Amino acid sequence: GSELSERIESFVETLKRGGGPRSSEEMARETLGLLRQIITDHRWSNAGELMELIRREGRRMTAAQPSETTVGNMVRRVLKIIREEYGRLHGHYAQLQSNIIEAINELLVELEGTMENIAAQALEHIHSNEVIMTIGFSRTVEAFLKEAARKRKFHVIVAECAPFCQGHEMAVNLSKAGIETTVMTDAAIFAVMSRVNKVIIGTKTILANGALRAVTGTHTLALAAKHHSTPLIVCAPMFKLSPQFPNEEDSFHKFVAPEEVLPFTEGDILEKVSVHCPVFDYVPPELITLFISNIGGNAPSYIYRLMSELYHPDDHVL
Amino acid sequence: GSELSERIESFVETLKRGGGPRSSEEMARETLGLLRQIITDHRWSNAGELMELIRREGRRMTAAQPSETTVGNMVRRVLKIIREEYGRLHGHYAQLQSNIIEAINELLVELEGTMENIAAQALEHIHSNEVIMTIGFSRTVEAFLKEAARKRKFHVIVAECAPFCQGHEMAVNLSKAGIETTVMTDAAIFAVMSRVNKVIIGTKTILANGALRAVTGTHTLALAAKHHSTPLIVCAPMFKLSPQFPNEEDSFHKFVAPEEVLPFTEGDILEKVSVHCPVFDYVPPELITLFISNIGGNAPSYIYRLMSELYHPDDHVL
Ligand SMILES: O=C(COc1ccc(Cl)cc1)N[C@H]1CC[C@H](NC(=O)COc2ccc(Cl)cc2)CC1
């Protein structure tokens, strides 16, 4: 009641203001915690009433941060789980609730071992004396690299995503493990791409076409990799996979303050300039070769089957 | 007279039977020796009579081995040299002959230092820790590599041209110099092409389009390099440049016995099979990035200017 609405309002304002928490897996765990806390302390007669309640509570989290699709498609996965439980019990008050409890607990068991399974199958994609190029900062790709370097000796080009230099942290965290890393800017991507053998990047949101949004400037890396014919490896979990079509809804990119691009101390020329800072970008699925999830490697021509197995077509509007 | 026609007949039968001599530079030096010997021991009143005599003597060498264009376009270069001498003396018996003597001597002075100038400018195209892939056997490319390895440390993939494995000699002659070479077949070209940074090949004949014939299977290497966007380096002298257009005349490829592909001890299935062995292939000029001659690096969109500076348009039929 009071604590429920208090924590819901706190989560909504946390998604409205900034990125809280920092890890997307931690935000997914807090999303499952919010959904189990909202189903354990409420009352319903029909399962469709709970479906409408979860939809009404998810619309606010979607309108809080539209660029954060993880809470929205996790709400949609929990909606499909509750729909499948109502379907298997339809062909109902405490038994359905206990089934929802054990299913969301099984979802946390599956979600805690996602990066572990990605690091487990990391060995079948990296050979010795290999030139790797990445962009931005992501825990999945650096875990991939620090597991692949346990038995193999290779090189990683840590290209920074530079609206704000977050890839320096990835370069330092790899060089502490000894991956023989090299730091450059966004302007040397195609200049170094003639020596890059594979492209291993992360993403923020996998779309329904197999398209993906990620840290900005990676569409340029995908174009240079398609020019030089190198395969792209997308190490991405199964909760960044969303049924939002690219040109269907607006607010695709996330815009931040232009201070990180052009500072406030520039002068009188700030009045007559328009400085936009997209921290994301669009990558079409034909520029992608392989997706790496915790269940195995999948093609961009196979994301629709995971969409059918994880999502329901009457929930794509939410 | 007798010794002249004897040596002409010997050179004609040597070009009819096989490849004699083995080096193309040695054959060019013997071509200039044959042309100076045929002009020093004969009589003419007009320069056009000598032009028709050199044309009549060059038609036999062209019909001897049509795949050996070096003697034909060297005869054509000497024809343009004698035409320019007649032009500068037109705006004449011993002075024109002495001018032809000093011009062909200057042509030998320019021809002896071709591979030396290619090895001199070899340094501005090779960097350290580089993956090079070659095909066949050629003295220019191996001289390029053994000069480039005097100050740089890199790797060469010596892919064999395999109607008959001649690239093994190139691999041994490089591994005696320590280039850290690797030997494979023609079937692993696109399999290894995802780690190849540059393609450095030789050629047999540069055509008028900028197209080239070389040791066979290099069109496949050019297609794989165009797929993986690596630049092609053609280390080729300025006497393999000929005005013969690709689709203009017949007998482009040189066919040899099918014994090197399928042996005589195969059995009864040799009666009902057609085994063809082209030891050359066609490479279009859009699959080529850069030509390396002794005067400097030139584009495939610049071969026509060397054609205008070295050849005359009334001599392309010969
Ligand atoms: O050391 C590096 C550093 O790479 C970079 C560092 C920085 C930048 Cl900006 C770009 C690239 N790269 C090595 C990676 C192995 C390669 N190849 C080999 O060592 C051997 O190559 C072979 C050998 C055999 C075959 Cl069949 C194919 C390739 C040499 C260059």
Swiss-Prot record, chains A, B:
Can you say where in the cell this protein is located?
Cytoplasm, Cytosol
Q: Which ranges of the sequence are coiled-coil? A: none
GO BP of this protein: central nervous system development; cytoplasmic translational initiation; myelination; oligodendrocyte development; ovarian follicle development; regulation of translational initiation; response to glucose; response to heat
Q: Does the keyword Cytoplasm apply?
A: yes
- Sorted alphabetically, which InterPro entries does this protein's record hold? eIF2B_beta_subunit, IF-2B-related, IF_2B-like_C, NagB/RpiA_transferase-like
**Activity regulation remarks:** Activated by the chemical integrated stress response (ISR) inhibitor ISRIB which stimulates guanine nucleotide exchange factor activity for both phosphorylated and unphosphorylated eIF2.
Could you give one GO CC term from the UniProt record? cytoplasm
Disease connection: Leukoencephalopathy with vanishing white matter 2: An autosomal recessive brain disease characterized by neurological features including progressive cerebellar ataxia, spasticity, and cognitive deficits. Brain imaging shows abnormal white matter that vanishes over time and is replaced by cerebrospinal fluid. Disease severity ranges from fatal infantile forms to adult forms without neurological deterioration. The disease is progressive with, in most individuals, additional episodes of rapid deterioration following febrile infections or minor head trauma.
Q: How does it assemble?
A: Component of the translation initiation factor 2B (eIF2B) complex which is a heterodecamer of two sets of five different subunits: alpha, beta, gamma, delta and epsilon. Subunits alpha, beta and delta comprise a regulatory subcomplex and subunits epsilon and gamma comprise a catalytic subcomplex. Within the complex, the hexameric regulatory complex resides at the center, with the two heterodimeric catalytic subcomplexes bound on opposite sides.
Q: What does this protein do?
A: Acts as a component of the translation initiation factor 2B (eIF2B) complex, which catalyzes the exchange of GDP for GTP on eukaryotic initiation factor 2 (eIF2) gamma subunit. Its guanine nucleotide exchange factor activity is repressed when bound to eIF2 complex phosphorylated on the alpha subunit, thereby limiting the amount of methionyl-initiator methionine tRNA available to the ribosome and consequently global translation is repressed.
Q: Which family does it belong to?
A: Belongs to the eIF-2B alpha/beta/delta subunits family.
Q: What is this protein called?
A: Translation initiation factor eIF2B subunit beta
